[PDB]
C-alpha cells in the first residue's frame, strides 16, 4: 500500500472504533431499514470505503472525507434525530471532521518536513 492508502486506512480504523456495534460496517438493506432505497440515492458504509481504499479509488483525503460525510448524511436523512442511528452518525461525523480538519492535516504536513 502507498502512504495515502495507509493514512486513509488509519482514519478509517479510528472512525470505525466509534462504531463498536457495527451499524456502519456494511450497507443498510431495505430488510433492515424499510424503504431505505426509496429515500437514499447514494448509499455508503465503512466496508465500501475500505474496499475503495484497497482498490486505490481515493486520490486524496478530500475524496475519502466526502464518502465519510455522505455515509453520516444518509443516516441523518433517513433516521429522525431521536434515534440511535442519527445520534451515532452525528458522533462519528464530528469525530471525523475533527480528525480530518485543515488544522489536523497541517500538523501532519509539518511533521512531514
- Give min distance, CB of 83 to Br ion, in A: 4
Q: Is position 85 an interface residue for ligand 43U (rule: CB under 6 A)?
A: yes
Q: Is 56 left (phi over 0), alpha (psi -120 to 50) or beta?
A: left
Q: Is 108 in the site for ligand 43U (CB under 6 A)?
A: no
33 binds, among ligand 43U, Br ion, none (CB under 5 to 8 A by kind): ligand 43U
Q: Report 5-44 residues binding ligand 43U (CB under 6 A).
A: 23-24, 26, 28, 32-33
**Site for ligand 43U, rule CB under 6 A:** 23-24, 26, 28, 32-33, 75, 78-79, 85
Amino acid at each position: 500500500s502507498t502512504p495515502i492508502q495507509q493514512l486513509l486506512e488509519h482514519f478509517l480504523r479510528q472512525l470505525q472504533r466509534k462504531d463498536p456495534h457495527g451499524f456502519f460496517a456494511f450497507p443498510v438493506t431495505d430488510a433492515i431499514a424499510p424503504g431505505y432505497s426509496m429515500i437514499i440515492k447514494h448509499p455508503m458504509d465503512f466496508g465500501t470505503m475500505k474496499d475503495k481504499i484497497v482498490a486505490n479509488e481515493y486520490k486524496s483525503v478530500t475524496e475519502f472525507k466526502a464518502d465519510f460525510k455522505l455515509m453520516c448524511d444518509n443516516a441523518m436523512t433517513y433516521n429522525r434525530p431521536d434515534t440511535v442511528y442519527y445520534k451515532l452518525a452525528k458522533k462519528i461525523l464530528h469525530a471525523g471532521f475533527k480528525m480530518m480538519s485543515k488544522e489536523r492535516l497541517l500538523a501532519l504536513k509539518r511533521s512531514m518536513s
